[PDB]
Amino acid sequence: MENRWQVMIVWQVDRMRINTWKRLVKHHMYISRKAKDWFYRHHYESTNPKISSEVHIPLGDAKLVITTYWGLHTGERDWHLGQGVSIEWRKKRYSTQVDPDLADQLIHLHYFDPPLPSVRKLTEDRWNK
Amino acid sequence: MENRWQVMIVWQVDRMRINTWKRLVKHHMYISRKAKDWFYRHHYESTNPKISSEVHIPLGDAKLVITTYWGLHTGERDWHLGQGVSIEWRKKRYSTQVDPDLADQLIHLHYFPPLPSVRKLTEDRWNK
Amino acid sequence: MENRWQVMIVWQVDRMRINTWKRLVKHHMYISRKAKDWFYRHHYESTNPKISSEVHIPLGDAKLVITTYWGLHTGERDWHLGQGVSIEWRKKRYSTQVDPDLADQLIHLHYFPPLPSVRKLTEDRWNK
Amino acid sequence: MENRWQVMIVWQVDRMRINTWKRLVKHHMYISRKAKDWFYRHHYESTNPKISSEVHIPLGDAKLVITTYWGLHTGERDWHLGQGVSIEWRKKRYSTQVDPDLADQLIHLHYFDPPLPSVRKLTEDRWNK
Amino acid sequence: GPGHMDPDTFSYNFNNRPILSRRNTVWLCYEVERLDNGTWVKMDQHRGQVYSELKYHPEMRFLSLVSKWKLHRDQEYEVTWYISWSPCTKCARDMATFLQENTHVTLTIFVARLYYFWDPDYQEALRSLAQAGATIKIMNYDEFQHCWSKFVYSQGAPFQPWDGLDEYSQALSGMLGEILRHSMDPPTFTFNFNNERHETYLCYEVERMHNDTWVKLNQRRGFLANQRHAELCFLDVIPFWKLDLDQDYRVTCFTSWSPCFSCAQEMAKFISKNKHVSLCIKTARIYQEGLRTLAEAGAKISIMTYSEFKHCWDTFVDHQGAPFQPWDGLDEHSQDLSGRLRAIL
Amino acid sequence: GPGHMDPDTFSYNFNNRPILSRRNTVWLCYEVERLDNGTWVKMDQHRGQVYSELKYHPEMRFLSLVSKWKLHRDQEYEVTWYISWSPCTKCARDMATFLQENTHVTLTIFVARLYYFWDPDYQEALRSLAQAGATIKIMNYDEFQHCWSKFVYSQGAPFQPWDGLDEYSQALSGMLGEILRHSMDPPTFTFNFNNERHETYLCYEVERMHNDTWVKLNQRRGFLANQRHAELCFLDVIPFWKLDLDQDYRVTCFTSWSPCFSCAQEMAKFISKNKHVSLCIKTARIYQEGLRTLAEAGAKISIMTYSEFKHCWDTFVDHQGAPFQPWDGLDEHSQDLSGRLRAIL
Amino acid sequence: EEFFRKLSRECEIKYTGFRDRPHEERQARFQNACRDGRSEIAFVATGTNLSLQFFPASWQGEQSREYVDLEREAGKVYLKAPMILNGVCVIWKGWIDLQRLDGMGCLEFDLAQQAFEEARRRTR
Amino acid sequence: QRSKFENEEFFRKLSRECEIKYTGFRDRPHEERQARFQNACRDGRSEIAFVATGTNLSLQFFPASWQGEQREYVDLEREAGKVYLKAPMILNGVCVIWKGWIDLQRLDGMGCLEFDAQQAFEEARRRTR
Amino acid sequence: EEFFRKLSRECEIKYTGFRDRPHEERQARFQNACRDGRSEIAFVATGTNLSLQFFPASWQGEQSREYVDLEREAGKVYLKAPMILNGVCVIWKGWIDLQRLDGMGCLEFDLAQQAFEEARRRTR
Amino acid sequence: QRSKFENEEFFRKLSRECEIKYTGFRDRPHEERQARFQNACRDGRSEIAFVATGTNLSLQFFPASWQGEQREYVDLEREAGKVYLKAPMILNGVCVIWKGWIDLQRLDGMGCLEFDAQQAFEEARRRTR
RNA sequence: CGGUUGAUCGUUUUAACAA
RNA sequence: CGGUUGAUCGUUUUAACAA
Ligand SMILES: [Cl-]
Ligand SMILES: [Cl-]
Ligand SMILES: [Zn+2]
Ligand SMILES: [Zn+2]
Ligand SMILES: [Zn+2]
Ligand SMILES: [Zn+2]
């Protein structure tokens, strides 16, 4: 087969939650520097044509990267218009996709041991419940 | 049935040109007061169902009546609903049709910010 | 100087009609894949500065080439910049002009959601 | 002379202050009923074609009426686009126009003896200073 | 945004006076419902209000919003509009061509005022919009209350209706019925215009005198019903025609029941005030001093016969290629009623 | 609203790549200044940003905003635009007719990308807009930094430019100069093209072979300057013409100084990679191994004479009905330079 | 006058009715409208936007003999109308075939009149 | 009255340093501004506004028909090229008169104040302090 | 064929150039463009949107004698062009006066041809 | 691994009750949706998304060219009228494989999970708790 | 164009500016 | 239509939704 694919679990979220997450991250990154070691990569540093942002969080000797997307297919619900998030953990060309629960646990273990930026509130589906 | 009719020359124009005409005419008889002697008759003051509005320009003992029309089954882009303009010199029960050039010359003889001109209203670019 | 020229029949159309044409043609050779055998040539692939785009419809041993044009000094509402369409049946260095009806009949003979039709593109309502 | 006129001192204010004044009055009129005896007359109860609102405040046996306008001439400053206010005090067909300072003093003498609605903040010119 | 407009703009713009001059902006409040398991459920996030721009009417912005929504095409949707002015020609045509291409959405429109109801261009645009599958109605007091409660940032303040809301609503309903050219289905005609019923339906036509000859007016033909009785609504519709004071007009009325006391007094006063309008009433039943006073005022009270029934069936009945069929006991009852009226008057 | 757009939309939309496909919205950041006592003072409240709609471009919304502003007509105003796409035909025409009717306002436009720069319709629209009194420029790095600091809700984050900003800006400047048909005034021509200066200005023309005859291209004629030297900018402009690989093209260059070492190496590599493009360089001065390498690569290095000077004056000089007048010491210096070049090469 | 001969050369007339509808009902509507009257009939010149309108006399507030007749010859209709234009009493006559609503038409001529002539000469 | 007029801050502010100007249609050319001002002064069916140059205070001359409940004049014939303005009113409980004039060419001029239940308002002011 | 005679009756041709500009320079530009070439010349039919385009031969990628001549008679220009249309070799010839850029024009006719005729008969 | 897969909440949630559906262009008619899905499955140059019916979780099959750094298949010829999907991945540090199928007519089907530095992530998880 | 409004598409066009 | 983008006017169109 001449078609080669990549597999990603993307949590479908609406636009307001994406905006709130980005605003909180940038507010706690520059104004109230509780998270100053984070690297907020801007839009166009990627080979994937649809990757709106990429937040890198150094955890000891590895890093947890949260990438958001825009321009995906529509969802089942009314406000899943093509935006989503995906969180993974990488260490020197070894990557594993991470549950948002575990991602927030890692974030609060290293950094936190305006509301604090959490990924559980970002990725939670408020339209299916 | 067909023993009685009425004949006029009507120039098809666009609705925006009619609106421009009826805006400058109102402006010039209300704000600028250069043509405060002119008269304006609305749609409900005429028996013809197709008459839009009438503008009366006094020329002394006679007058120039310019009338607008909706409801024409001609249309501009073939919408079976088109506007039109007609000119009529009237002097004490005597009436005749007047081409736009002579009407504009009559207006300039007795009268006179854009000015209300009949050539700009009646001319065409759809066929020319 | 005037010893060499080129003669074609070009039908003046509107820009929105050209956009509709080049949208349905792309849709039908990319998404629906009913006309995936057609070819599309852009503006920079032709020597004529006035050629907009070319669409090639294979008809077996021959082809039908429909070309769009900007830059015509005719204009639609007298803007000295008008679009145009030309049709050409081509068979191994032999060429001729084809009216829209025969071209549409050729397309329906070998081929076939709106469909890309030449009558809808070439017909006129500005003079008819 | 066949032309008869009426004279009013209108304090030219911008749109944002008008909106804030109306919102505060209606919020302190229905939700937090500290000013519940006030009568907020709506748009079209007037002979004057341009009188957007009219707030009546009973002071003992008389009433202080504050009327706002829209559709006035433009002002000297950039944001004086045709809205204004006027405050007066009336008792049985006797009316007198009231300084906003005195108007707020009367308001606080009888009723107050979200921010409280004051006319000094409404009528103050923040564009000329 | 869902329901955050100040009350003053609402009261200024949604005033329903038929002739209102200085309202140059159009406000459109939209809501959407979806069909699920046979019931229409409200779509709480797909609602709001928009206003017009210099060259951008609210209908265009609503179409852009619908395009951005990306609604499931395998479902059924109902959209409700509450608008201050009726759509113009461009907006009506584009809404019609949007409805023709999306058959999974239906549209219901409530209008506060009719925009250029005397202009046949806008009348034809509105007729085309109605033919495309849209329901056009006149915004009544219940809809005003609903918009006040739902789309207005009233902060719990009670709604205070302006003076003359009901009369303006009835007049606008009459004009809209004239514009849309409504017709009665045969069952209603048979049930209401039988001489042998808690509703009174009346038809009307107008003629003008010209060289001792009556000429019919194509636009001034129609019918109406009760919502005050129907005669008051008709008399409220009358003044907006601006009948000229120099020519002679005749208004022919086809009413089911006889006018009441107050309605007869109002009609007599109206026809006494306007000497240029003659009245010809041809009733079918009797609901007698008021009738005598109305007849002595100048009216011509008569009783419907077979010719009037045939004219009504041909004129104000949606027969759809079906000839009129008289019912049993028509001629005898009509003759008895005519004789009784002649004896009384 | 003044400066409250998120950085991601800014970075996505104001990318200045000449060919960018999936940016279907237009963003317009506007600011206004006023003339007071001979100085231009910023109008802090009359600034902001807007975006386009389905059928409502940002220029129309800006015109509506200007209408709502009600600016004093007895004053002077300067408006600055920062826009992602160059205006289309409708917007350009309406902006031109707005500028023609309001002579108390001037407009300066910075564009991130040129929209259909290969379409003569949009080229004519842009030329008409420039003739109406508007200044059209190409958005450079300083303007990007200004927009990031002023119109972007960056929360103090530093601006990170994308890759290739400067090259794209130079290419777009070259294309805009071609479109607007700029010309040199006589003083600059005399000061720069004298053979007896810290700037290098170069002119260029293109011809195509057809039956052993060179035919000129009307659009492919112009000149440019330094902002990297001008030769690199010209070589960056070249690839966007999409010269065909089957026909023969000749590019004639009129350069003041001799090319530098790096510029000569780049030109030699470019003309070696593209065998379908011949190069004819006719310089006026010398700024020799690089020149020898360029000549051996395939170029034809020559020295300007009276005919070339006359052609330059007639072609790329805004003489405005004035014939060319040669300066003193032209023929002797030209002959000496030609002899020196012949001896060297 | 230059206006007359400018609008009297190679001028053919053609009917404009329910243009966005099929031709058969178009001639049917032209037929019955010409029979009963009570309607406006338009005849536009091909070259320019000049149009002859036929309005019923009841539409005017007051009040000259002119006719449209199709019963003299089947399949064609004849048009005759006098009208005073620029101070002279020109008469416009023409015909169109009933099958194609096209045909020919031309205008040939027959105290207030001299008053308008004096005013027109004064307006030069 | 006289002492209150000469002692209170508001009356001194409006009587000492005040110059007026007409800004009716500030976005329109001078000629039609003059024409509109003349028309409005002559018909008596539209408002005319005069704004104090320094502050946001303005005097509006509404037509008497807009009042609906009930000496002043805006006259032209006293002097060619000028309009003279007299407006009696009741301000802060005392009877005051406003006098001014503006030229038709510059749409500018001068304007100042003069001096020319009643006891219930005095009692209210005394109890206000 | 019906198409030919449909577009060959009472057909007059007229020049379309810089229409939004005065006439004098319009004929000057028509003159010099017809002299030098290197430009496109349009001739539209009055009735419909059919137009004859005159493109320089250098604009084509490859390669039949046809001319536009004004020096044989002053004040008028003659146009001659053969072109194969629908399988037949029709020749379009005409003239326009140089003063008014208007005139007359008509098309009269003179293995792959039979191949197209067979294909056309098959497409019925 | 096996015990972690059978004991953790996330893996059980994604493995026990899961059904997938394709919602690519929900505002478009069924026919062109089928055509677009077939085209996207055949060219290998565009993403395809599969959304879990209950939650907001989705599987995206990005083309390998979009990765840029580096068994899975989306195949058609196994059975006419169905598309079969296999996607290996690393989730929460353990290697897991997703298996599913959807029919071309209904654009619906089934999908579930199976089982088929590494120590550094285990250490991080132990220290996370 | 304050007209018993015949209706110019008037900040009379705006969610937060005093939370 | 992921094309070395020739550019459909894609929530890739939005200030606060976790203040
Ligand atoms: Cl509308
Ligand atoms: Cl634009
Ligand atoms: Zn509209
Ligand atoms: Zn009653
Ligand atoms: Zn534009
Ligand atoms: Zn260099």
| DSSP, residue by residue, B71-82 | EESS-SSS-S-E
Q: Is E231 marked active-site?
A: yes
Q: Do A10 and J25 touch (CB under 8 A)?
A: no
The alpha carbon of residue G67 and the mean position of all alpha carbons in its chain are separated, in whole angstroms, by 10
G89 within 8 A of B37, measured Cβ to Cβ: no
I80 within 8 A of I91, measured Cβ to Cβ: yes
Q: Which ligand is nearest to the CA of F94?
A: 5
Computed on alpha carbons and rounded to an integer, the radius of gyration of chain I in Å comes to 17
Bridge partners, E7 (sequence order) = none
Q: Do F45 and D79 touch (CB under 8 A)?
A: yes
**What whole-number distance in Å separates Cα of residue B76 and Cα of residue B68?**
15
Of E252, E248, E303, the residue nearest E274 (C-alpha): E248
At residue F135, the 3 state secondary structure works out as strand
Across the interface, of F121, F219, F242, the residue whose CB is closest to C44 is F242
Rounded to 5 degrees, what angle do the CA atoms G87, G91, G93 make?
155
Ligand 6: centre distance to CA F17 (Å): 24
**What whole-number distance in Å separates Cα of residue C53 and Cα of residue C41?**
6
**What whole-number distance in Å separates Cα of residue E135 and Cα of residue J91?**
54
- Per DSSP (E only), the strands in G1-120 are 12-15, 41-45, 51-55, 67-69, 76-85, 88-97, 102-109
Bridge partners, G95 (sequence order) = G78, G104
**Contact E/H (≥3 CB pairs under 8 Å):** no
At residue H81, the 3 state secondary structure works out as coil
Bridge partners, C11 (sequence order) = C85, I50
Strand K bases near protein CB (under 7 Å) are 1-19
The alpha carbon of residue F299 and the mean position of all alpha carbons in its chain are separated, in whole angstroms, by 26
Q: What is the dihedral of CA J89, J90, J95, J97, to 10 degrees?
A: -30
- The active-site residue, picked from F31, F59, F178, F231, is F231
Residue E208: what residue type?
R
Question: CA A17 → C1' L16, Å?
Answer: 12
**What whole-number distance in Å separates Cα of residue G43 and Cα of residue G57?**
18
E241 contacts on B by Cβ (under 8 Å): 44
User: How many residue contacts between A and F have a Cβ separation below 8 Å?
Assistant: 28
**What whole-number distance in Å separates Cα of residue D99 and Cα of residue F124?**
61
| DSSP, residue by residue, F35-52 | EETTEEEEEEEEEEEEE-
Ligand 3: centre distance to CA E57 (Å): 5
Tokens found for residue F65: 């905003």
Tally Cβ neighbours within 10 Å of residue C58: 14
C82 within 8 A of C76, measured Cβ to Cβ: yes
Domain count, chain I: 1
Q: Do B97 and G86 touch (CB under 8 A)?
A: yes
The alpha carbon of residue E238 and the mean position of all alpha carbons in its chain are separated, in whole angstroms, by 13
F46 within 8 A of F69, measured Cβ to Cβ: yes
In this structure, the strands spanning A53-59 and B6-9 are unpaired
Containing E94, the helix (H) or strand (E) segment is helix E89-101
**What whole-number distance in Å separates Cα of residue B60 and Cα of residue E194?**
64
Q: Which of I26, I49, I71, I80 to mutate to test the interface with C (most CBs of C within 10 A)?
A: I49
Q: Do B6 and G67 touch (CB under 8 A)?
A: no
**Contact C/E (≥3 CB pairs under 8 Å):** no
Tokens found for residue I32: 């010099």
Report the nearest residue to nucleotide K12, CA vs C1'.
D71
F120 contacts on C by Cβ (under 8 Å): 70-71, 81
Q: CB of A71 under 7 A from strand L? A: yes
Tokens found for residue E321: 């290629």
**What whole-number distance in Å separates Cα of residue C49 and Cα of residue C43?**
8
Alpha helix (H) residue ranges in C8-99: 15-30
Across the interface, of F45, F46, F70, the residue whose CB is closest to D81 is F70
Alpha helix (H) residue ranges in chain D: 15-26, 100-110, 119-123
In this structure, the strands spanning D95-97 and D83-90 are antiparallel
B91 to B101, B106, C63, G119, G121: CA distances (angstroms): 19, 14, 71, 12, 17
Q: Which of residues 82-111 of A touch strand L (CB under 7 A)?
A: 82-83
Chains in touch with D (3+ beta-carbon pairs under 8 Å) read: E, F, H
| CB-count exposure of residue F200 (10 Å: 0-12, 13-18, 19+) | buried
User: How many residue contacts between D and F have a Cβ separation below 8 Å?
Assistant: 7
Contacts of D41 (CB under 8 A, 6+ apart): D53, D54, D55, D56
DSSP state of D31: I
Give the determination technique. cryo-EM
Q: Do F6 and A42 touch (CB under 8 A)?
A: no
D103 within 8 A of D87, measured Cβ to Cβ: yes
Residue I103 phi/psi, 5-degree rounding, is 175, -160
**What whole-number distance in Å separates Cα of residue F313 and Cα of residue F327?**
13
Rounded to 5 degrees, what angle do the CA atoms A70, A73, A77 make?
100
HEC assignment per residue over chain I = CHHHHHCCCCCEEEECCCCCCCHHHHHHHHHHHHHHCCCCEEEEECCCCEEEEEECHHHCCCCCCCEEECCCCCCEEEEEEEEEECCEEEEEEEEEECCCCEEEEEEEECCHHHHHHHHHHHCC
Tokens found for residue G61: 């507030």
Of A96, A123, A18, the residue nearest J56 (C-alpha): A123
Rounded to 5 degrees, what angle do the CA atoms E67, E71, E75 make?
140
Of F6, F76, F55, F60, the residue nearest F28 (C-alpha): F60
| CB-count exposure of residue H31 (10 Å: 0-12, 13-18, 19+) | exposed
- Which residue from H minimizes the CA distance to B30? H39
At residue G81, the 3 state secondary structure works out as strand
I105 within 8 A of I79, measured Cβ to Cβ: yes
J34 to E52, E261, I8, J109: CA distances (angstroms): 39, 70, 50, 14
**Max Cα–Cα distance, chain C, nearest Å:** 49
Strand L bases near protein CB (under 7 Å) are 1-19
Across the interface, of C1, C7, C109, the residue whose CB is closest to I81 is C7
B69 within 8 A of B49, measured Cβ to Cβ: no
DSSP state of B45: G
**What whole-number distance in Å separates Cα of residue E338 and Cα of residue J42?**
84
Query: What is the residue whose two structure tokens read 């700024």?
Result: F287
Residue E143, CB half-sphere, CA atoms under 13 Å: how many?
23
- Tell me the resolution in Å: 2.8
| DSSP, residue by residue, F6-33 | -HHHHHHHS---SS--S----EEEEEEE
Tokens found for residue D101: 């300072």
Ligand 1: centre distance to CA C62 (Å): 52
Q: Which of residues 56-95 of F touch strand L (CB under 7 A)?
A: 57, 85, 88
Using a CB–CB cutoff of 8 Å, tell me whether F65 touches chain D. Answer: no
**Contact J/G (≥3 CB pairs under 8 Å):** no
Q: Do F56 and E54 touch (CB under 8 A)?
A: no
Query: What is the residue whose two structure tokens read 């635009």?
Result: F81
Total count of residues recorded for chain D: 129
Tokens found for residue C2: 């005037």
**What whole-number distance in Å separates Cα of residue F20 and Cα of residue F248?**
29
At residue F198, the 3 state secondary structure works out as coil
Q: Calculate helix-pair angle for E230-237, E165-180, nearest 10 degrees.
A: 80
Q: Which of G3, G51, G85 to mutate to test the interface with B (most CBs of B within 10 A)?
A: G51
**What whole-number distance in Å separates Cα of residue F163 and Cα of residue B22?**
57
Bridge partners, E80 (sequence order) = E31, E108
Distance from CA of F52 to the nearest CA of H (A): 27
**What whole-number distance in Å separates Cα of residue F249 and Cα of residue G45?**
54
Using a CB–CB cutoff of 8 Å, tell me whether E215 touches chain G. Answer: yes
Q: Do B126 and C125 touch (CB under 8 A)?
A: no
Q: Do F11 and A27 touch (CB under 8 A)?
A: no
Q: CB of C36 under 7 A from strand L? A: no
Tokens found for residue F52: 């386009």
| Domain that includes residue J111, residue range | 1-129
Residue E193: what residue type?
F
- Which residue from C minimizes the CA distance to I50? C11
**What whole-number distance in Å separates Cα of residue H17 and Cα of residue G123?**
59
J90 within 8 A of J65, measured Cβ to Cβ: no
Nucleotide nearest to E115 (CA to C1'): K7
**Own/partner long-range contacts of A45-50 (Cβ < 8 Å, ≥24 apart):** A46/J68, A47/J65, A47/J66, A47/J67, A47/J68, A48/J62, A48/J66, A48/J67, A48/J68, A49/J66
End-to-end CA distance of chain D: 41
Domains in chain F (CATH in brackets) are 7-180 (3.40.140.10), 186-344 (3.40.140.10)
Tokens found for residue G97: 């075939």
**What whole-number distance in Å separates Cα of residue A30 and Cα of residue A12?**
28
| DSSP, residue by residue, E183-248 | -B-HHHHHHHS--------EEEEEEEESSS-EEEEEEEEEEE-----HHHHHHHHGGGG---SSS-
Of B103, B97, B98, B99, the residue nearest B116 (C-alpha): B103
**What whole-number distance in Å separates Cα of residue F319 and Cα of residue F341?**
31
Tokens found for residue D56: 């009546």
Total count of residues recorded for chain E: 345
**What whole-number distance in Å separates Cα of residue D82 and Cα of residue D11?**
11
| DSSP, residue by residue, A79-110 | T-SSEEEEEEEESSS-EEE--HHHHHHHHHHH
Tally Cβ neighbours within 10 Å of residue F115: 16
Question: CA D39 → C1' K12, Å?
Answer: 23
**What whole-number distance in Å separates Cα of residue H47 and Cα of residue F91?**
38
In this structure, the strands spanning I76-85 and I67-69 are antiparallel
Bridge partners, F50 (sequence order) = F28
The alpha carbon of residue F284 and the mean position of all alpha carbons in its chain are separated, in whole angstroms, by 23
Across the interface, of H27, H48, H92, the residue whose CB is closest to D99 is H92
Tokens found for residue J63: 């083309």
